[PDB]
Design a protein around this ligand. Structure first.
Ligand SMILES: *[C@@H]1O[C@H](CO)[C@@H](O)[C@H](O)[C@H]1NC(C)=O
Lengths: 213, 250, 213
């Protein structure tokens, strides 16, 4: 069973850069390597069949070469519309197998997050749980540290965060971190704080609220 | 004792196995072999062949059998497709190019042919059918080149989107890995109708000894027993066409 | 005009059965190599099964003897019969026309198959109330299975919105936030309503998000 080892798994480049992805097959597959592009929530789209041939419609910026075991996929000048995950595939030997994929991100200038904090609604407190939301809006790069403080006590293990896909226009990221307590625990404390560390921040930024006020 | 027909012509297997040009598999050749004597030991002992799969017979017993007719089909395929020239196989080749029956009796013979059949820029002479609506029947040959309608729009002989040329080229190249190199295949088909056998091994006939326990061989019927004159009418001697009863012994 | 539209996905219990279909336009399904390929959430691509024009079928070992591929020429539709479904069968299931075996040159947008003994739940929607550029949103909490769609002001409000990827809480239910930044001078005058829709249940909810007084 053929294994498609794709390199690298993630890549970050700037508009107009020359992006190279490689794929190595564990056995000779001659030229039967294809390359797919998947955008978030979309289905894959075939860009290159038979190592080097361009599907009709596909911009000439895309190309590929190779025969045997070592394959190359190239984007000649990277474009905004090319944010996607790319996969190689050998399609000749049963079963067909795909490479692990290469997630491609646009590089841009540093942007600090705008940070907001939302207390739990009173409606939700009726049902026995409190969700506290922290929002980091439109930042770059993706690395951001969020630290929750309840009466100055750091919370571990009761928050989940979630990151948007890179923006088409902005090329920035957005994050939300949600801290979950029981109503009981939530009413036992006053100061609810969200602390945000990021490249574009000289020092960490805190947003807090006092329960009630 | 051994009783074969008095056939003496050599069977023309040389021009099948040693032909300088071979057919494409979609257009596989068939040579009808009859009224001759073939020395299959040349084949089943040769070191040229890399596969020699025989169904319904054992290759080394082949110099002691007779058949009504032999068919020799020949073509070229990729190396790692050789396994598909077999009964019950599925795939592009076995379904759409060359298919063997449930009850195949014969031998599949193949040998690497990269030296003869690949060119430096790719040999685009050798094709296979890639598109077809239905499966081939066993031993059926389709060489049509009609544009394949993969969609609802008619093609009017212009190939384009959803309108594919049905054949695909192997493009054999000398640097191909062994599984992508061309192999020459010969399929021998041993046919046994209710008729006098015309294709025999090279075994020499001996005297017809009656009334005595003997090991015998009548066109492939091998036993140990006593052959006597028989009053039945419908084993029969090939050369004299006389009926012989068989009674066993040791 | 070519089309591949999958349907039949949904939540289904382990050991259960499900039949996906894939209706085609312009492609005649019975004249093509046709494949099913699947994608487990946030993961790569795995080929499932293949139907030749002439009726030959191939299956990935991981589904052999459990899945069956078939078609209906009149309806020009491809089927995937699934039996004895398993946790790790959960994935998005794509049908694709194959220009020759496993050369996937046209893919449908997929149907989502969730294999679980967890029950269906509609979400509760709570507001993230604001206090230019203020930020506000909607907390869509405690639903199952995916997916949920969130729009703002029945489709009119669209710029600056961020709807986040759902995340799986330690409770086994999903939750997500959808946020938007609006001129803070427009608060008090302008109405903001998020339209939450959860097709796996028959739940639609609209939530007025207004500044907490
Ligand atoms: C083909 O040619 C080789 C070399 O001359 C010979 O040894 C072999 O017996 C030939 N095969 C047949 C079937 O005539």
């Amino acid at each position: 069973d053929i294994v498609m080892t794709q390199s690298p798994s993630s890549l970050s480049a700037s508009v107009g850069d020359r992006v190279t992805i490689t794929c190595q097959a564990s056995q000779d597959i001659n030229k039967y390597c294809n390359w797919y592009q998947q955008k978030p929530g979309k289905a894959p789209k075939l860009l290159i069949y038979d190592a080097s041939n361009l599907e009709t419609g596909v911009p000439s910026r895309f190309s590929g070469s190779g025969s045997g075991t070592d394959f190359t996929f190239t984007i000649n000048s990277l474009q905004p519309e090319d944010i996607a995950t790319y996969y190689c595939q050998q399609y000749d030997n049963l079963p067909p197998t795909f490479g692990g994929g290469t997630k491609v991100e646009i590089k841009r200038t540093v942007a600090a997050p705008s940070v907001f904090i939302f207390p739990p609604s009173d409606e939700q407190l009726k049902s026995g749980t409190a969700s506290v939301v922290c929002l980091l809006n439109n930042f770059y790069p993706r690395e951001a540290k969020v630290q929750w403080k309840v009466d100055n006590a750091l919370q571990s293990g009761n928050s989940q965060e979630s990151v948007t896909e890179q923006d088409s226009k902005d090329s920035t990221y957005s994050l939300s971190s949600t801290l979950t307590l029981s109503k009981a625990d939530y009413e036992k404390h006053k100061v609810y704080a969200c602390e945000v560390t990021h490249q574009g921040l000289s020092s960490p930024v805190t947003k807090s609220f006092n329960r009630g006020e | 004792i051994v009783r074969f027909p008095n056939i003496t012509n050599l069977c023309p297997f040389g021009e099948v196995f040693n032909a300088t040009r071979f057919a494409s598999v979609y257009a596989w050749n068939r040579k009808r072999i009859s009224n001759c004597v073939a020395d299959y030991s040349v084949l089943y002992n040769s070191a040229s062949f890399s596969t020699f799969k025989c169904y319904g017979v054992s290759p080394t017993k082949l110099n002691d059998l007779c058949f009504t007719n032999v068919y020799a089909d020949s073509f070229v395929i990729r190396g790692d497709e050789v396994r598909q020239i077999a009964p019950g196989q599925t795939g592009k080749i076995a379904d759409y190019n060359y298919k063997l029956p449930d009850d195949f009796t014969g031998c599949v013979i193949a040998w690497n042919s990269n030296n003869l059949d690949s060119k430096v820029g790719g040999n685009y002479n050798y094709l296979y059918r890639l598109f077809r609506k239905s499966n081939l029947k066993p031993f059926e040959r389709d060489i049509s080149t009609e544009i394949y309608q993969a969609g609802s729009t008619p093609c009017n002989g212009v190939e384009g989107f959803n309108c594919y040329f049905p054949l695909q080229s192997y493009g054999f190249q000398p640097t191909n890995g062994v599984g992508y190199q061309p192999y020459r295949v010969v399929v021998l088909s041993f046919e046994l109708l209710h008729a006098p056998a015309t294709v025999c091994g090279p075994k020499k006939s001996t005297n017809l000894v009656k009334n005595k326990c003997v090991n015998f061989n009548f066109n492939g019927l091998t036993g140990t027993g006593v052959l006597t004159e028989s009053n039945k009418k419908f084993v029969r001697d090939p050369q004299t066409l006389e009926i012989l009863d068989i009674t066993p012994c040791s | 005009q070519v089309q591949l539209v999958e349907s039949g996905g949904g939540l289904i219990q382990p050991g259960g059965s499900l039949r996906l279909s894939c209706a085609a336009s312009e492609f005649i399904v019975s004249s093509n190599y046709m494949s099913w390929v699947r994608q487990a959430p946030g993961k790569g691509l795995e080929w499932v099964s293949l139907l030749y024009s002439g009726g030959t079928t191939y299956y990935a070992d991981s589904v052999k003897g459990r899945f069956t591929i078939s078609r209906d020429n009149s309806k020009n539709t491809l089927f995937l019969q699934m039996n004895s479904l398993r946790a790790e069968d959960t994935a998005m299931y794509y049908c694709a026309r194959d220009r020759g075996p496993w050369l996937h040159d046209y893919w449908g947008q997929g149907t989502l198959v969730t294999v679980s003994s967890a029950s269906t739940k509609g979400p509760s929607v709570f507001p993230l109330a604001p206090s230019g550029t203020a930020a506000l949103g909607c907390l869509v909490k405690d639903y199952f299975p995916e997916p949920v769609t969130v729009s703002w002001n029945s489709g009119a409000l669209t710029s600056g919105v961020h709807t986040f990827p759902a995340v799986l809480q330690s409770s086994g239910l999903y939750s997500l936030s959808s946020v938007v930044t609006v001129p803070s001078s427009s608060l008090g005058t302008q109405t903001y309503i998020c339209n939450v829709n959860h097709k796996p249940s028959n739940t639609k909810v609209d939530k007025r998000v207004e500044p907490k007084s």
